[PDB]
């Protein structure tokens, strides 16, 4: 009866997953794995399944290893958690789709659209239904496009600039200002001056939050032409 | 004592380099008498701020008024520190052009009256001043250099001026994306109908920098 439909339905879901990843790593994935995740009646079973699938798309090799270890359900509940967090969902989804793009291989589907399409009356969807909505799109063979996330732009400067400190050194800050052609209207600020404006201790250096804070001044300094 | 006022006059005149000039001659002890500590310190700060302009005001008998005004502009809630900065900028312009900043003056002083008096002391020692803008100033500036907000089009002109907006072995595949103005807005969930508000400009600033440092355009 249902055992059998579930097996054809879930079986087909597994087959599209395997295909989109080009694992048609595919052997490890079986209907019984998907069955193992939960009893359909349990509230948050669609979520757990949608997340488990998203994980598979996100990391096939890694998700087989987890499946073998019998921790697929746990790792799926973990992802729902990461995304259930305060302001976590939108950027978490972006990162998740970037990975799914990586492993997946004209207009395409983006996270804002997925957030719209799940959830109600202009509000963003919550993780389970959002991920389901993602799955349903994978099933329709939609392509995905993602823009980067706000944190990505600050993170990027900390990864790119070569420094032993966890924060940006006044020296580091000054090298960057140089690369940008920098370091009332017409004053030209030093790196130190920049720090002084935002009440930043040179011993403490520039943290990511701080980089974000002093960003407008770096722009102004460039547009100003003062330097 | 008009002996004291006399010396005050002489430093004021000197630090502005009006000693053997007409702008120094307009300043008379009786002017200073006509003008209490606060009013005097402010009147003097004004003179240092704008000698030519302050003679015209003095000769019109409105020096006291203009001085009470400056005390007002500085009496306010979070007015004093930045007001003092702007004032010192002007005074550095007219006199000269290891330094003293407004936090130091506030500490050494002890509101506006005694602070101005301490500024004046420093002018007397010949100290140099170092003054900074406020964080708000940097956002507020871009908006001048006319919808109320910045248009997507405006945003795009700015990105062009910065060499971005599109007008090898990447650690992240986003490292290669070159964002449109519209994309920039999309990242931060900003409506194109509303435009870029100052708070929004602040928010999207890091991406403009990244886009340049990235070399993706």
UniProtKB/Swiss-Prot annotation, chain A:
It comes from the Eukaryota. Residues 1-227 are extracellular. It is found in: Cell membrane; Recycling endosome membrane; Apical cell membrane. Disulfide bonds join 23-25, 28-64, 108-143, 188-227. The extracellular N-terminal ectodomain is cleaved when cells are Zn(2+) deficient, N-terminally cleaved SLC39A4 is internalized at a faster rate. Under excess Zn(2+) conditions, SLC39A4 on the cell surface is rapidly endocytosed, ubiquitinated and degraded. Homodimer. Belongs to the ZIP transporter (TC 2.A.5) family. The two metal binding sites M1 and M2 that are halfway through the membrane form a binuclear metal center. M1 is essential to Zn(2+) transport, while the other, M2 appears to have an auxiliary role presumably by acting as an additional transport site that can modulate the properties of the primary transport site. The binuclear metal center plays a key role in Zn(2+) sensing. Selective transporter that mediates the uptake of Zn(2+). Plays an essential role for dietary zinc uptake from small intestine. The Zn(2+) uniporter activity is regulated by zinc availability. Also exhibits polyspecific binding and transport of Cu(2+), Cd(2+) and possibly Ni(2+) but at higher concentrations. This is Zinc transporter ZIP4.
